[PDB]
Amino acid sequence: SAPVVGIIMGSQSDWETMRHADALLTELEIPHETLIVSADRTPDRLADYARTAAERGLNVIIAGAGGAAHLPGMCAAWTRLPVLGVPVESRALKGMDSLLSIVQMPGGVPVGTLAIGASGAKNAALLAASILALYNPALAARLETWRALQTASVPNSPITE
Amino acid sequence: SAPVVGIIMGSQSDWETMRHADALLTELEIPHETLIVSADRTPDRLADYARTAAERGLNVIIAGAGGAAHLPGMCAAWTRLPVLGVPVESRALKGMDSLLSIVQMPGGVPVGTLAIGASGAKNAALLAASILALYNPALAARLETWRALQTASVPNSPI
Amino acid sequence: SAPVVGIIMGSQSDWETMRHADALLTELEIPHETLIVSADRTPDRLADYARTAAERGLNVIIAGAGGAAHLPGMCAAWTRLPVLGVPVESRALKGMDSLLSIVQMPGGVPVGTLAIGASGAKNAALLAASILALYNPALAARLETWRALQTASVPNSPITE
Amino acid sequence: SAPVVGIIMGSQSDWETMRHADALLTELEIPHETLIVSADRTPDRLADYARTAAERGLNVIIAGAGGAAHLPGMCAAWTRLPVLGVPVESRALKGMDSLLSIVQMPGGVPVGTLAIGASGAKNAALLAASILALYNPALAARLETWRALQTASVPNSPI
Amino acid sequence: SAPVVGIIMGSQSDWETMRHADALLTELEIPHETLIVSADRTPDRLADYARTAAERGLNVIIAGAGGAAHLPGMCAAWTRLPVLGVPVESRALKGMDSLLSIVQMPGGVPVGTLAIGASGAKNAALLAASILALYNPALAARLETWRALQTASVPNSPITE
Amino acid sequence: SAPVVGIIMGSQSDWETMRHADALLTELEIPHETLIVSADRTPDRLADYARTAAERGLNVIIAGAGGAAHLPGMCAAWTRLPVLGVPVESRALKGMDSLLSIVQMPGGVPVGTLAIGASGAKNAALLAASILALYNPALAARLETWRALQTASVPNSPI
Amino acid sequence: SAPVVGIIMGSQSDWETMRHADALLTELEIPHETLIVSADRTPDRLADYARTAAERGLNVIIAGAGGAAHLPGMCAAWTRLPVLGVPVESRALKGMDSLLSIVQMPGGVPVGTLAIGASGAKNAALLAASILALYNPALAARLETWRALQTASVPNSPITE
Amino acid sequence: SAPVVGIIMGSQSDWETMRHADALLTELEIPHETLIVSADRTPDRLADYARTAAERGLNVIIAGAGGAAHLPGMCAAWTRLPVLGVPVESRALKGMDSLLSIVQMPGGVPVGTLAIGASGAKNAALLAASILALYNPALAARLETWRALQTASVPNSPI
Ligand SMILES: Nc1cncn1[C@@H]1O[C@H](COP(=O)(O)O)[C@@H](O)[C@H]1O
Ligand SMILES: Nc1cncn1[C@@H]1O[C@H](COP(=O)(O)O)[C@@H](O)[C@H]1O
Ligand SMILES: Nc1cncn1[C@@H]1O[C@H](COP(=O)(O)O)[C@@H](O)[C@H]1O
Ligand SMILES: Nc1cncn1[C@@H]1O[C@H](COP(=O)(O)O)[C@@H](O)[C@H]1O
């Protein structure tokens, strides 16, 4: 019942992307919370959120943001938990600013970064699931079934119009 | 004593970078194995490595390569374990090729990607440690010490 | 009758692009097969496909994929045949990730890479045809006619609205 | 005597770049402090620095960092003071990561961004001076001299 | 009543972007002027505008332009005032040419550069306000209220469709 | 004895890169010719080279150049033979210009493009060999040996 | 009456861009020809076109192409005349491939390169006019009038919606 | 004897690049002047230079600069003469900033742009020569010789 993953994002505009992480965690029956935390507009909210995450029982944080994306990195600055970062696609630079802002963390403070956009959001949830699966055999079985099914569902030839 | 993290790299020329992940795991006393596995030159070696990793008791795989860096993604394709990707700085394109080749995985098969180069190698080991810390209280305490020491050690002013 | 080129692609979404390779091979009367093989979702299918390609009588593989595109490279890892890679245009990064993921193969395992998108797909078929033409005089004549006609069909001035 | 500009930088390795901002402020006789504050390694040090800057009588903050450079943006998040950002040239991506990480702030929290590297460090100090000059006539005159000397000193032909 | 900020832009096409700077200065009750000055088409107009800005009572210049954007840099060449530059998004290169053309000023002639597009325009006004706030306590209070309200208005969770 | 692969390059400064294609063809005992042909400085030399290549009994052309690299594309324009393109690493843009100039051929005139630099030169020769192997069983066996040795030689762990 | 500028382009698809060069030359009363010449599909047509340009009385060549754009460079390889290159915007890479393919000519064979797209086409005509103006006083007066008018037609403030 | 080409550059640090344009003009016996004019540090020097260029009998201006390279565009803004732009290779971004800052001129004010670095400097001088050749038959013949010698001198095979 209690959340074991936190999904955080910098704004409502990030939800179109971050919803894919939420949906996948629900699919895999992983209890989680989904919040807006702005690194730029609510820095003390972020400090408190990240500092207290482990004691609140969270095991993984998925953080999504675009542009000069500081949310995942600053979350990782304050938590000892693994933080996974989703680069949200930006208007002009198509998430290249998002990506570099997230992935290029200095040695000492990791962010596990996924692909730009919805694929990255979905993969952040799957990566979070694979982490939790290491010490939750029920989840590990559900993940195995999920991966096996993905493999089995790939067609052999295209629908050629 | 038995490895719980596998560090794999596409070639000897990646060692200068991946040694930083090795050093960090050793500092934190995390049993690990350190291997050369090339997605493109040794594809069956990779298939067997990745397929058997969980049975062997590995919990996290750290995979580094440069150029068109297929090693992390293909590893993730064959294992259910978390795979962390280190883009090795390439000669021409300075790891931008490595970075895009690794991070841009389609939905369904994740690679947790870290920075280009030595920083990313170190951070992949730290990220692996933070994952292992979730169910190893002694290591969690050692990782807390490591992070606390990092923070406390930053000078207040430049020399 | 038996296929001498294999066209493979990572997903149905690649078909809009890869159809151009299929169409050109048909135009030149080159027997071929057209399949979906996912490097990420069906890695053992790919290993078996690429490992057995030469013994099944294939001479050239055209492989198309986008994003972090591993399909052409991993195909080449397992076959001694020439593998030609088509970078499928991606949403955010416009096929730049596709291109670099395909073309930047390490020394030892080649992928002959074509342009991003439909042009690359068509050129992969033409390149495949030029390879087969070296030891198939009927095809060589058809290719010569095809190239000659392309040259002859270029107008001398634009239709100026 | 009390500092009116704070120069902060993510680490010692930024000093080679940020020293140019320090030198310029000193040349123009602008009292300033020069500190290492890491957004990612010392986040609470940064929070306290940025939150208290105005109370302490700082007017402008110059912040430099490389890579995923969060220092200027996070500083701006906690202060009402103008924050100027210097992208430090990174090893792999030559400060393109630093530049995008700094300049691409969403509406609401500004960072005035300067060029990558030493040029940008110098220009952040000059920009801070032009801001201070608005309400300090003696400094305004010294800045006018500095700019006049820069212009007058350019040779007419190459050696 | 007399303007203390000048907003200048290279063309009418820049207004869609630069209007956001105008609107914010008005919101904060900062008297300003809003003009078209073309570095390429009206270089002597620019020289005169920038040279006389301080004596006309301006304290900050916000300059917006796209493509090979010379307006902010050339403005700074002629004024001792702080000049803030807004990179206007360009058609092909999405404001990357704008950004590099503005931000990469040589040591000696600063331009304080903001984000590509509308966000940068709004931030240029906010940065200008923060500068003026240093010696205008009424404005400083309005800015504090403005920032505080932005912080307070961030929701705690997304509207999940 | 008569060449079946032509290696052409835009200038002497490409040799440091293109020599790797030469070495590989020689290792595999593939008769070849190695020439300097500049699309831009010797356009008629190129026209004649490319137009006559098939008559002369060439089967594959490997063409390398840097910068705005027109050599492979223009070669392909005049021959029906497969043309493989090697982007030579340029000074400023590190072969990104070379790469785009070569790979981005419009539909109708193909260039099979390989990686930037020495890797790409080696791979163009390997790709040419894999093409020739389709109708030369002795060479096919030698290429199989080469690939087998590459795979088998990869160490299991770094030094 | 006889053309003094040649405008050449690789295909009909380039005309949407290259029409702007044609229109400007007509505006300035510069006699010119406008043709399709494909470097990739009609290389011998290009060789003959470029080799004979000076003897046919042409003074400047404007060449437009996109993607891996070889037309301007190969034109310059064969003519001693000044060749100006227009990078036509490409689909995926937005004319970055066009630009680098044109501008990055090796020392020894120049192409004077203009901006990506319609602006570059118009500027190539203006650059061509400025070249011809050096030895044609009537044209020089028309160009002076044209530049003066451009300067005079810039508004002083935006139409603020 | 009176200059018909002006070479201008943003600073002394551009000379290493712009000297190649100077050498070429001298080789072809084209009278020219070679000056430092900074758009940003000496804007009025530039205004006067560019405004008076035609009166002084200049026919072509070659302008080189690096970084946010405003010199060619602003020169073109004040003169009716053809302006050719040389992007000088910058430290961080390797002249990509220089290139975009120069080539991306909006319709109405052209800059004929050449390659980044020494190549571009040489080519700007060659382009200026090809322009002057249109109405100077002696120079046209010398340029024909230069181009003929370039073509004829390319070796047939690498050393
Ligand atoms: N992508 C790839 C596949 N197999 C090896 N590599 C990469 O090739 C680069 C150069 O390796 P080498 O020196 O062996 O050619 C290294 O970064 C290595 O990961
Ligand atoms: N982004 C960031 C956060 N904390 C430090 N950095 C940057 O990390 C780079 C390398 O620092 P170091 O040598 O300490 O690892 C410097 O540019 C420094 O600003
Ligand atoms: N693009 C091109 C056309 N002709 C030569 N080049 C390239 O120019 C580069 C530099 O050559 P050089 O030293 O002769 O100027 C080389 O990569 C060569 O292929
Ligand atoms: N963009 C610009 C304006 N004024 C000078 N520059 C450029 O600044 C670079 C570095 O010059 P310096 O060493 O004087 O700082 C040179 O490429 C010079 O053209």
Side-chain angles (χ1 to χ4, degrees), chain B residues 33-98:
Chain B
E33 64 187 2
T34 300
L35 302 166
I36 295 171
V37 180
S38 168
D40 305 285
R41 292 190 181 190
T42 66
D44 295 322
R45 183 193 299 182
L46 176 59
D48 185 57
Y49 187 83
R51 202 185 274 129
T52 61
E55 290 159 43
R56 289 191 276 122
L58 300 180
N59 285 35
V60 179
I61 301 172
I62 296 172
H70 305 142
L71 179 65
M74 291 309 302
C75 190
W78 272 299
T79 185
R80 284 53 172 138
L81 296 177
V83 177
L84 307 181
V86 178
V88 177
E89 195 183 324
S90 52
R91 188 207 196 284
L93 303 185
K94 305 306 173 196
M96 182 62 48
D97 54 2
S98 317

Side-chain angles (χ1 to χ4, degrees), chain D residues 75-148:
Chain D
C75 190
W78 272 299
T79 185
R80 284 53 172 138
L81 296 177
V83 177
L84 307 181
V86 178
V88 177
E89 195 183 324
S90 52
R91 188 207 196 284
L93 303 185
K94 305 306 173 196
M96 182 62 48
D97 54 2
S98 317
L99 168 63
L100 296 184
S101 286
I102 294 168
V103 79
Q104 290 294 93
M105 289 303 278
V109 179
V111 170
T113 310
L114 287 309
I116 298 168
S119 281
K122 179 168 163 174
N123 283 351
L126 280 160
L127 185 50
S130 71
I131 287 158
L132 295 168
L134 295 175
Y135 48 109
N136 180 337
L139 170 69
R142 293 199 302 284
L143 176 60
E144 165 69 36
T145 295
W146 194 99
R147 293 289 306 268

